[PDB]
Amino acid sequence: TKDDFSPESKGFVENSYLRGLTPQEFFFHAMAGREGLIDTAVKTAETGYIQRRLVK
DNA sequence: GGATTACACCCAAGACACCAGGCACGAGACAGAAA
Numbered sequence A: 001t002k003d004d005f006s007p008e009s010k011g012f013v014e015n016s017y018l019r020g021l022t023p024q025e026f027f028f029h030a031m032a033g034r035e036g037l038i039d040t041a042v043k044t045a046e047t048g049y050i051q052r053r054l055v056k
Numbered sequence B: 001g002g003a004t005t006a007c008a009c010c011c012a013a014g015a016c017a018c019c020a021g022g023c024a025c026g027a028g029a030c031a032g033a034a035a
Helices: A022-056
Strands: none
Touching: none
């Protein structure tokens, strides 16, 4: 429902991996994992440029 | 306005002066013409 600030409504996975994730928790956890992948794949180039400038 | 934005490796696939038009050499066929 609209205007719901409960923990389960904004991405709190109550279960464990052994117990299994409900579809909403699955989607939120997928969003977080996608953010992690993007952050890695983006910061690697910036770090490479910084190290090249330092070495030069 | 200018300059620069990680490293290495693999494979596959599609494009890369085309052309047209005016000038030359050789040849040959079907029609001329004397007999």
